[PDB]
């Protein structure tokens, strides 16, 4: 009929508050029709046809549902707070009972794997009442909501011990030590794993009075609070939610990238292969790949080969070779922006995030329609009109970008595809190929040049802006989207209070105190991170320290002009905050 839910009944607008699930339904109406159906079925059975009940459902779903695809978020202290010796204590308060793990982890613990699954962490799981280190063994009891579990670590005799609500948990035998013996290694830091719809609280014991069971257990034993003598609070790190693009590791168990140097007759190539395809533990999820450096469009849009045309042109070209034996329907090719953080197991070009801003005049006429999207890619399967594979050359999708006009057109097997994307001025486009591995050899990055189109290295590197020879400098490298990254919780958050002043005045939001942070902007990646996060990225920290040293050196010995120039890069507020 077209009716929709409405808190107030209105026939003309087709409003009905009854359009809700039966559990959320009104009690009076539900009991009315409920007793009606009780009476009907009870009369049905009293009629003599005593129909038997169906198979009673005793199954349990075990609550597999979760936000996106993340089953747990790992919370840990900063790596710099690792303890090498000593004897330390901290408490974990379980707000809601469920699948949570608390224990001690090494600085090398990955934020995506289960806490205690590998050797990086030593954790206690109370929901299953089972320890976790390179496997699981039964230990302790199960906690309820509100129970507080204390974690005790002794780095002298290499012993760890857990206490639940005060009593010491013990092993299958009478031994009280959670883990008999380990090695110091690189140190230990507190860590907790929180499951779906799980709430917990960690108390590092900055105030000894906050620790609730420390007096009965831990104080006389000689254990010390983790924050026994810290003037400022511990910076706590959590698992990052948004996937990011990072360079493919050389030791990756699935992905392998090899660099093929370009000969006189062959363009330089970057080839991506699947190590463990046709073997166990292969990954069939769509793997997202990206080149490190982007192509930047012009600030303002305009409104054999000729060497002059190749000097005055701005169109850049790269292509991909879909390896014969790899299904083109599982591979997408094109350009993506820096904002592309959508990691989905099933990727389709229909669900690419997009918006269309259409600025108009006061008369209502559409002055301009601008389509904005993070992903501008095409599918190889729909482009492969001949079908199947050719050994002489695989499906060769080629991408050309006109930095002066923002026109993204795709060339395939010498014929131009119908799909075309027009991008905004100054947009930074990253070459990217999304593919699901159906073969050991999936695809490779061809960096050649088609007729009258400037090669990609010119648009990538300003030094080679005028070099027609294709190049693959070591800076450019394939990056894959992954969830294995930590994140730094801010020490201080903005203070805002919310309260509904009155029915007339509505809800009020009030923030009056200023708070600032310094952001470190990576130029090539179009990214930005807090400078205080560099406590865990050693390479960036070292490079920025040496950049500061160079900044000091160029203005050293009273180079006043250089100092005035540097005042723009580093200003008074930045200096005074640092």
């Amino acid at each position: 009929q077209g009716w929709t839910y409405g808190i107030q009944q209105d026939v003309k607008n087709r409003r009905n508050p009854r359009l809700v699930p039966y559990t959320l339904l009104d009690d009076r109406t539900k009991k009315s029709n409920k007793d009606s159906l009780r009476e009907a079925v009870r009369t049905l059975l009293g009629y003599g046809y005593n129909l038997e009940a169906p198979d009673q459902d005793h199954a349990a779903r075990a609550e597999v549902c979760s936000g996106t695809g993340e089953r747990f978020r790992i919370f840990r202290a900063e790596k710099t707070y690792a303890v090498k010796a000593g004897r330390w204590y901290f408490e974990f308060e379980t707000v809601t009972a469920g699948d949570m793990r608390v224990g001690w982890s090494r600085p090398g613990c990955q934020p995506d794997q289960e806490l205690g699954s590998d050797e990086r962490a030593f954790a206690f799981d109370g929901f299953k009442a089972q320890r976790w280190h390179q496997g699981n063994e039964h230990y302790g009891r199960s906690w309820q909501a509100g129970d507080v579990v204390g974690c005790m670590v002794d780095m002298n005799e290499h012993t760890m011990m857990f206490t639940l609500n005060g009593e010491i948990l013990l092993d299958d035998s009478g031994s009280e030590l959670a883990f008999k013996d380990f090695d110091v290694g690189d140190g230990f830091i507190p860590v907790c794993s929180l499951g779906v719809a799980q709430v917990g609280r960690m108390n590092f014991g900055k105030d000894v009075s906050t620790l609730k069971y420390f007096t009965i257990c831990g104080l006389q034993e000689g254990y010390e609070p983790f924050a026994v003598n810290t003037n400022r609070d511990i910076t706590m790190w959590l698992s990052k939610r948004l996937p990011q693009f990072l360079q493919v590791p050389s030791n990756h168990e699935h992905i392998e990238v090899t660099r093929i140097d370009g000969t006189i007759d062959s363009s330089p190539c970057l080839k991506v292969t699947q190590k463990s395809f046709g073997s166990q533990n292969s990954n069939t999820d769509i793997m997202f790949y990206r080149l490190s450096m982007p192509i930047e469009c012009a600030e303002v849009f305009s409104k054999r080969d000729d060497y002059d045309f190749l000097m005055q042109t701005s169109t850049y070209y790269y292509s991909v070779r879909i390896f014969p034996g790899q299904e083109p329907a599982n591979v997408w090719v094109g350009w993506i922006t820096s904002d592309f953080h959508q990691y989905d197991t099933g990727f389709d070009l229909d669900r690419v995030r997009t918006v269309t801003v259409t600025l108009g005049d006061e008369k209502g006429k559409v002055h301009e329609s601008i389509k904005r999207s993070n992903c501008y890619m095409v599918c190889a399967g729909e482009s492969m009109s001949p079908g199947q594979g050719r050994n002489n050359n695989g499906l060769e999708i080629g991408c050309v970008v006109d930095a002066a006009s923002g026109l993204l057109t795709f060339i395939a097997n010498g014929k131009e595809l119908s799909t075309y994307y027009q991008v905004e001025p100054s947009t930074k486009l990253f070459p990217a190929v999304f593919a699901q591995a159906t073969s050991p050899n999936v695809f490779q990055f061809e960096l050649g040049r088609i007729k009258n189109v400037m090669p990609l290295s010119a648009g990538l590197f300003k030094s080679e802006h005028k070099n027609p020879v294709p190049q693959c400098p070591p800076r450019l490298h394939v990056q894959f989207l992954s969830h294995v990254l930590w994140s730094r919780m801010p020490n201080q958050f903005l203070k805002v209070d919310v309260s509904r002043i009155s029915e007339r005045q509505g809800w009020l939001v009030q923030c009056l105190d200023p708070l600032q942070f310094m952001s470190l902007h990576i130029p090539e990646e179009n990214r930005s991170v807090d400078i205080l996060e560099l406590t865990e990225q050693e390479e960036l920290l070292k490079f920025h320290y040496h950049t500061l040293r160079l900044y000091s050196a160029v203005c050293a010995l009273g180079n006043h002009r250089v100092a005035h120039a540097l005042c723009s890069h580093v200003d008074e507020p930045q200096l005074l905050y640092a």
């Binding site: 978020r73 907790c192 509505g506 950049t547 160079l550 930045q574």
Partner: protein
Amino acid sequence: VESPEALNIIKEGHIKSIISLLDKHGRNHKVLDVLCSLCVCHGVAVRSNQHLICDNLLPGRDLLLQTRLVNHVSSMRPNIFLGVSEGSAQYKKWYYELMVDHTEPFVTAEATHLRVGWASTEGYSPYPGGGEEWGGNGVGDDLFSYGFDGLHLWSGCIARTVSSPNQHLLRTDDVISCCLDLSAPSISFRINGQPVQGMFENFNIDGLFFPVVSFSAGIKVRFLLGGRHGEFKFLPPPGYAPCYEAVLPKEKLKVEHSREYKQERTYTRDLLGPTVSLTQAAFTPIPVDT
């Protein structure tokens, strides 16, 4: 580092090639060390080398890591999670209105951030999608949010100047009213009763939407949600239900932080794991065919 005579031999072409090494190969700290040694040797500073390194490296701002102070930006959202799907009983037209009580223009050196509009959630989960929980990112910075700061339309860190009567940044005693049409993707803004010549079209409607404002220091604004909670300064456009009508019966409409972590004591801090997707928020009748 050893021979002062080397510095005189080093020329403009060599000092450019050294920087081109950093450009082509990548971030390498020993190249920066070599450049430092070029500037000063044995306590003697070379003005030419210091000038060349500066004028050939600094102005580009493409190799060295840039740094800047950014004001923290937080976001408040109501409890309502309005969305559109087939066979679902939710109204496709919605309206809410914002009242700016006071806004200091420059609490700090950087201008204050005040953007209002709608944001979406990836899937049916209650987490806002595509945006970092903390930082200098607000409404209109990620591609899942749609904002209006008074002069520009914000979506995915891209701002386009929108024509409006008496163009100005949002100041004291400015009234912003937002309209969202989920039947045909449409987000419309209405400033002080005058129509903003701006338009959001053909955006993804798979996820759940919600009103949201991104603010910085020195912001004091009020949500006029209509009905019991508020009263609209201007009449809603025809057929546009007020946003307070989307609250579930047993649930109480409250304004909370868009993100799950806020300012509080570290030991009292409630650590939240992943939350179950709110697919039950959308109601769709599923009768078994007989």
